[PDB]
Design a protein around this ligand. Sequence first.
Ligand SMILES: CCCCCCCCCCCCC/C=C/[C@@H](O)[C@H](CO)NC(=O)CCCCC
Ligand SMILES: CCCCCCCCCCCCCCCC
Lengths: 153, 48, 423, 499, 43
Amino acid sequence: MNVGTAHSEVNPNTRVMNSRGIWLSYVLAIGLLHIVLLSIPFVSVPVVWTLTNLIHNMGMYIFLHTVKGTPFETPDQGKARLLTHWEQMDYGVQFTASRKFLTITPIVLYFLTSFYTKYDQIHFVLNTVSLMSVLIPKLPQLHGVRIFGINKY
Amino acid sequence: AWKQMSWFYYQYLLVTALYMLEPWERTVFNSMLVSIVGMALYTGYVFM
Amino acid sequence: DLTVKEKEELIEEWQPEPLVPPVPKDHPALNYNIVSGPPSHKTVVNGKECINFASFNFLGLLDNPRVKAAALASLKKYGVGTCGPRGFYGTFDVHLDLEDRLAKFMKTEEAIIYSYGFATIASAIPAYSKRGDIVFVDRAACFAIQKGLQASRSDIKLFKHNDMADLERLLKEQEIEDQKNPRKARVTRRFIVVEGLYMNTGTICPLPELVKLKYKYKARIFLEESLSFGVLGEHGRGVTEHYGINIDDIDLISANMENALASIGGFCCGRSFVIDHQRLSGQGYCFSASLPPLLAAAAIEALNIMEENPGIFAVLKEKCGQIHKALQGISGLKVVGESLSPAFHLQLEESTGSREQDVRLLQEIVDQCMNRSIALTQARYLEKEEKCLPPPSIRVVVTVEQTEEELERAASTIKEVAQAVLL
Amino acid sequence: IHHVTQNGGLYKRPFNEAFEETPMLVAVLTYVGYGVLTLFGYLRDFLRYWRIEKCHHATEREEQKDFVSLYQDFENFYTRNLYMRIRDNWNRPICSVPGARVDIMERQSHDYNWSFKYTGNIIKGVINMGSYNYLGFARNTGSCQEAAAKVLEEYGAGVCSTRQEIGNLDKHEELEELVARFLGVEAAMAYGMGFATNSMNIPALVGKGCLILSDELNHASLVLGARLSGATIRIFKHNNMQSLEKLLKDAIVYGQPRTRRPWKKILILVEGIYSMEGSIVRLPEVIALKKKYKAYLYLDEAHSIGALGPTGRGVVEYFGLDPEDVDVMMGTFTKSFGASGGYIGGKKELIDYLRTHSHSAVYATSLSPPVVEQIITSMKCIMGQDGTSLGKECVQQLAENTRYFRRRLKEMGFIIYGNEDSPVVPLMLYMPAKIGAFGREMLKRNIGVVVVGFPATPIIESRARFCLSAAHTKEILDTALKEIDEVGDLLQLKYSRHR
Amino acid sequence: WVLVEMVQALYEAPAYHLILEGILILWIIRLLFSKTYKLQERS
Ligand SMILES: CCCCCCCCCCCCC/C=C/[C@@H](O)[C@H](CO)NC(=O)CCCCC
Ligand SMILES: CCCCCCCCCCCCCCCC
């Protein structure tokens, strides 16, 4: 309901990733997505481990680096209206506990998909080009920049 | 037995938050849950 | 850096300022006049019986027997006060019957009621105007509008009082910046805050010319008619009726239930698309207790009496231009306000040179006049915390109770005392 | 007498609270509900484009389609996708005097809460546990409501002016000298709205160049008043005397933000009982911390006045302290006295400055005589001037009800928050689907409660609140505990691990 | 059984693939030992 009924917080979208059980509940989602693809009968394991890595990085880019604003009306007069979820996290403070976990987990998922794919060349030019699209926006130097003014207003 | 079997369906509607959804939205979620659990048994009888 | 020995000495040096500053014993106010009994027509102020020209109830109603006997029937069946914030068991069936009845009076689509007249517009403005939006505000807007505009951290531009050639000059500059960045021009909202019968000047705004500018520059109007609701028009609807303007052209219309209705609270009316959004974001509506049931029952009866005979608005206007035409003789004071306004001011000609001296001169007339049988008061402002501070003046208020003999004898009593204080 | 903390505070009676944290398995299951609701909400947005016309919602006028859209579409995504689904829990209209038993008007929807309609029948008796009615002064009979009808037959409903003008009656001066004696201070002022007592008086004390220390969970009126002042605001951990003392310490040594100069003053905003958390502030440790750093204290005892203490004087009397240690004392008349309005109490020097420089004293209308006469008569019964014992019973009958209800719920297996002497009891439900089921279940068993969701609180802290009253009998409290035990077994709400 | 291949296919991994993976392990360590620092304030 109304933001500010049980907490002073003017924007509750900046403390959502610091909740109790959101780290272990987000790691179970990646594992659950990899088990429904692994159930497809007519697909080999290297293809499964590439679809798992590309689909996770595709949803992680949309939900953290594309959708900007807040889903509710807050009492801060719409100050985070032109920002993405990543830029709102912890009110703009860099290198926090949660901003290290979200930067590290795609790298770890990239090591397992490189070993299960047997270091294939075609699978290396798809997983490396997809992993870059989710590590570049997380650099502290790209906080608030829009290349060619895309996704600005 | 039937009175307790229906109670277990009620607990499944509360944890997955399907309790506060429309009847046509419950059928869309139940369709792919049995379609993903039914094809996971056919893949467990060809590679196991 | 910063050792533990220095740190402890830094906390011993500090000395805060006092909570509240002193140096008083000269302030114009800080001497409330005690009223013994109800502030009715014949009143007793500071142990003196006199006819008051200071209360804001124009159509009587404060002591109407039918209004009094209807708030009693809602006291014996509901109690005195609600115990909830209107979102949890705080809404009775009298609150739903007062909102539906107000919307039929205004011939509008929906209405919403608050429990305090100040917070109805201080909570409505920041619900629609966010950080990036542009608001064009008249320079003579009251304090509630200013607080509502401050709460909404948006860009504010003031224009001269009651001249559209200066508003259109500001609207054409926001349009020169609409080609400098078109992509941003489509995500900024434009609002025009105005008000019928301004309280600080006693003048009426030009609505017909302001409605044509709205459709030409794509900006939305916010009417705040707290002093003209129940006064202007032929049916007491307000300013929109005084001209002939379709009620659907205004967007939002806010007023309070404390001036003509002789009760407590405020209300806001409009279409559903704009009204039903304040119920989940209006700050003073979501986090405050509702309006007591006996106060809401006293407003519905006033609404019934207002609609029962609309000939009460024709008598208040005929005696509004009678006292205003009998005051255009005073040498030293000048009348400031329209002839169809029941709340015009009375300002000082040739100001001495300092506010303090001005206020002591007007206080002298106010005190010397009350000694006879005329209760008047001067307008009060917060001098430091205000945008454009108006000059000192003596407010004059007209109702339907005062007779012809009293109106004429009060206009002559303010001449004799003012021609012997200001010479 | 009992124990002293290093922060100078001395406690005379044990002060024990309890805030159990949510189980790992129950915490991971609430994220499954929110995801399934977010994913399904995105499918409805795209489905309302090139498909479903949804002819029931409101839209702009035909001659205003060129104007920039009034609202931001993404905001209010939760309103139409999550709140609309379970909205039949909140705006319930009642048609009787609210206390201990209330009539509710039955209503039903045919389009999943998008529209409502009143059938016509009324629910006769509902155990009211969602209204602030401590001490039970909310009645439509008695000698308290008989004196308000006598002051309404010769004064009228409302006034028509301001205090600084012709709107200062003799009734307004009688209530201000009585409220100063009750509280035990030098002077007091009364305003007429509780929300406006904080938002229109906090900006008349502090300004630019001052510092405000705010508590984690302070009320919205307290938070909006600070926003308008112009001062800097820093928040500290709830009831943490180590976090407040570190914020108080480094603010004196480092000075202002960019210019690095000394602050003009420092003001600490705290509160009595916190309603949604059920906890009591630690005054012996705040008061001994503001004396060592020369800060000022603003106390908001809106929920604790009348409810706490052995005579009903608030949280100052509950701890044994003196009322001259608090710079400003705010409160309301709607929670315990069955009336409306607010007040501020303090020195005769602070009430003389607020009588000329407060926004409400010069721009807003004053209190209504009928509601002023109710406060005078109800306040004069707690102090025992009336000559009857009705005021000594109710105050002591609220403490009994609170200890019996809070201790019987904890041994059932629920997770309850707050102090053991708090008359507000927050029961914990975590899943988002349980909010709309516990609300309907109660009303089906003939009980009314209040439930709070995700945006209002934190994501894993949805709850229900259980305001208690001194008008609840032992019979009504037994019937309520029976129905709450059956609904907790049906929805599996007994989460406690340390029972 | 199909596990030996993976380990046997790792030793014949191209030089450019092993460098990139080794450079990514140097970043984790560098970002694991970092202070907070609230961006760029009024400087
Ligand atoms: C069988 C299905 C199990 C679960 C599958 C669903 C998982 C995907 C759900 C999508 C999670 C959204 C992540 C963050 C989204 C933010 O852009 C959003 C607004 O910026 N913030 C929230 O409201 C965040 C509020 C927290 C919600 C989790
Ligand atoms: C006992 C295990 C139940 C299955 C739970 C695993 C999936 C839970 C994922 C819910 C969505 C995660 C939201 C966090 C992503 C930002």
